[PDB]
């Protein structure tokens, strides 16, 4: 555009949209499980991913992924949300943190223990 | 004498009844680190033959870089296709600040300090040519003198 046009209208700043409306930007947010279930992925995958509909304190009702080999969440578990998508499950934009609240870590896991929140086992 | 650095090797594909029939392309830089570089792009049925052919094409395509103590006499911008390249002179100690493609060319031309920038399309092949051409367009006071002297 002409400089006069630029003088006249200027440029428009690029606003970014959040992919994690867990309000207050907040690094994490806690909620209660409303429904614990299984969902099937989209092409080209197949399985029974574990999801949970969480009622957040931010006043939101979003579905969250339950990472890990196995869990212990029912229709009343209080858990902490983390925020992280699951490529295969459209609509799942957050992860449930394992190791906090009613969400047990994952026993037996020995490698990426930090995530999945599993205490270091003693080696005798 | 001459040093060679392989910029990139790709495995292109073509169609025939029956299936795809491949070829390999290779970009090779050749320099004496004394102000002389050459670019060669050789293609062949096999990677080695490709590289070799490339090296061979490179030596046939040389440029005399007006080195002035590890740097370029002046700044220049050259667009080759949709790729643009920016070369800026730099004081010693600066180093060669460039992407892998211009670097390989600059280093073998015997450049030691230079500011650089890849703009537009960053296609290796095309950025490479933009570079050689930038170097090729470099002039010296001595040169400008003979030119405007007349």
């Amino acid at each position: 555009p002409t400089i006069n046009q630029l003088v006249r209208k200027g440029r428009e700043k690029v606003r970014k949209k959040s992919k994690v409306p867990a309000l207050k930007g907040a690094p994490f947010r806690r909620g209660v499980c409303t429904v614990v279930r299984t969902v099937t992925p989209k092409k080209p995958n197949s399985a029974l991913r574990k999801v949970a509909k969480v009622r957040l304190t931010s006043g939101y009702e979003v579905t969250a992924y339950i990472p890990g080999e196995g869990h212990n969440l029912q229709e009343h578990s209080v858990v902490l949300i983390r925020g992280g998508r699951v490529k295969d499950l459209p609509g799942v934009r957050y992860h449930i943190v394992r190791g906090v609240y009613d969400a047990a870590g994952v026993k037996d896991r020995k490698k990426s223990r930090s995530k999945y929140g599993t205490k270091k086992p003693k080696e005798a | 004498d001459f040093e060679e650095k392989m910029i990139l090797i790709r495995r292109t594909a073509r169609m025939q009844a029956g299936g795809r029939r491949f070829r390999f392309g290779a970009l090779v830089v050749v320099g004496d680190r004394q102000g002389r570089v050459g670019l060669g792009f050789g293609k062949a049925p096999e990677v080695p033959l490709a590289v070799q052919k490339a090296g061979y094409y490179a030596r046939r395509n040389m440029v005399e870089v007006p080195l002035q103590n590890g740097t370029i006499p002046h700044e220049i911008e050259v667009e080759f296709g949709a790729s643009k390249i920016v070369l800026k002179p730099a004081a010693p100690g600066t180093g060669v600040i460039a992407g892998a493609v211009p670097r390989a060319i600059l280093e073998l031309a015997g450049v030691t300090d230079i500011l650089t920038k890849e703009l537009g399309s960053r296609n290796p092949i095309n950025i490479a040519y933009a570079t050689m051409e930038a170097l090729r367009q470099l002039r010296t006071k001595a040169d400008v003198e003979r030119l405007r002297k007349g």
């Binding site: - | 010693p92 100690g93 180093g95 060669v96 600040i97 892998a100």
Partner: protein, 208 residues
């Protein structure tokens, strides 16, 4: 806590012998002697062509693993270097050679740098007369680096300072094997050094 683990293993990963032990890395046993290929279960297999990145890394890894400095520590120096006037590459090396623990080693009061360090952490060293236990302390030019007045009698001090009797040392240094004192004369130049490292690549690793 600087590293603290098997060293004649790092020499192996760098394909170049590093003096992390001192007098054993001299007598047919630095492992680099009869077994110079990298560590681990895949050490003798053919090495795939290294990525530009790989090279700039392993290189820095050599230069750092030499002085046994931590990445944090190391990086701060390089930065300080970048800032300062003059060729960052050389200057960076000058600063690295100015670490007390290092000079102590370069003077022969200790065999290796790991040992040179401990001699400093235990006050067995003295800069300009006062005791100093900061291995990262920066020796400026003109400083006298002696041995603890009360540590000259120490067994270990004897051997090293003994084998130092008659044995030229660094052109920027000066050892008075007598009073067990030395003198940081000048900041070494790249020329003064003969390190198996192309600082250029290091500067490039951080350039990224």
């Amino acid at each position: 806590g600087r590293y603290i683990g098997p060293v004649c293993r790092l020499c192996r990963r760098e394909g170049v012998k590093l003096y992390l032990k001192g007098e054993r890395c001299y007598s047919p046993k630095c492992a680099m002697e009869r077994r110079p290929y990298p560590p681990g279960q895949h050490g003798q297999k053919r090495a795939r062509r290294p990525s530009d990145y790989a090279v700039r890394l392993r290189e820095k890894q050599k230069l750092r693993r030499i002085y046994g400095i931590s990445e944090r520590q190391f990086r701060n120096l390089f930065e300080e270097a970048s800032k300062k006037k003059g060729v960052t590459g050389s200057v960076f090396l000058g600063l690295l050679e100015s670490r007390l623990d290092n000079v102590v080693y370069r003077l022969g009061f200790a065999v290796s740098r790991r040992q040179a360090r401990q001699l400093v952490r235990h006050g067995h060293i003295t800069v300009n007369g006062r005791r100093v236990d900061l291995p990262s302390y920066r020796v400026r030019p003109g400083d006298e680096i002696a041995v603890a007045e009360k540590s000259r009698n120490l067994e270990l001090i004897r051997q090293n300072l003994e084998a130092m009797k008659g044995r030229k040392v660094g052109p920027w240094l000066s050892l008075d094997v007598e009073g067990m004192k030395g003198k940081f004369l000048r900041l070494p130049d790249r020329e003064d050094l003969a390190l198996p490292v192309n600082e250029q690549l290091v500067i490039e690793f951080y350039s990224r």
